[PDB]
């Protein structure tokens, strides 16, 4: 098992609604919420289910990233971003295009903190999307930004064999 965590409803933008169980975040502009964990070792896998949201960003941030600055427009933030029909990854304000299978519904995030990688997957189809190589300077927390509809996180997952 990798690090189990929930959304921290205290980290959540006033324009977001975090659910009772702290696993879904909905919109009622960097509308964001963090995982309630800082990771500074090991390998960790979690997924996000996307219920038809056309504007969102899923990723990781140093503590030094200010609240709701989590869409990869600084040096402390890495994010997979849907921008309507356009999917990019963003770190340090660099927008790097990716080409997912249409109707990307379930996204895998594999953080290898020790070896210094953030890998994004189409978890449903077992397609690698992009890997960030990082020499992590600080602990990182998962981050979720959503502009419409909702996201659901699944955490504490084994590192799957159905990916590579």
Residue numbers in the entry: 482 to 509, 526 to 661
Task: Pull verbatim passages from the article behind this deposition.
The tripartite motif (TRIM) proteins form one of the largest subfamilies of RING-type E3 ubiquitin ligases, comprising more than 80 members. TRIM family members typically contain a RING domain usually catalyzing ubiquitin transfer; one or two B-box domains mediating protein–protein interactions; and a large coiled-coil domain region, which is involved in self-association or oligomerization with other TRIM E3-ligase proteins. About two-thirds of human TRIM proteins feature a PRYSPRY domain, also known as the B30.2 domain, in their C-terminal region. All characterized family members shared the same overall PRYSPRY twisted β-sandwich fold consisting of a 7-stranded and a 6-stranded antiparallel β-sheet.
A characteristic feature of the putative substrate-binding site in the closely related homologs MID1 and MID2 is an arginine located at the C-terminus of β-strand 7 (R587 in MID1 and R637 in MID2) that projects its guanidinium group toward the center of the cavity and two neighboring tryptophan residues lining the pocket. MID1 is mutated in X-linked Opitz G/BBB syndrome, a rare genetic disorder that results in malformations along the midline of the body, including hypertelorism, hypospadias, and laryngo-tracheo-esophageal defects. Many of the reported mutations map to the PRYSPRY domain. Some of these, such as I536T and I555V, are large-to-small substitutions that potentially create internal cavities in the hydrophobic core of the β-sandwich, thereby reducing the thermodynamic stability of the domain. Like p53, the MID1 PRYSPRY domain is only moderately stable (DSF Tm of 47 °C), so it is also susceptible to global unfolding by cavity-creating mutations. The L626P mutation also perturbs the hydrophobic core of the β-sandwich and, being located in the middle of β-strand 11, also disrupts interstrand hydrogen bonds. The small-to-large mutation G532R introduces severe steric clashes and would bury a positive charge within a cluster of hydrophobic side chains, including Phe486 and Trp543. Therefore, this mutation is also likely to severely compromise the folding of the domain. The D611G mutation, for example, is located on the short loop connecting β-strands 9 and 10. This mutation results in the loss of a stabilizing hydrogen bond between the carboxylate group of Asp611 and the backbone nitrogen of Gly539 in the β3/β4 turn.
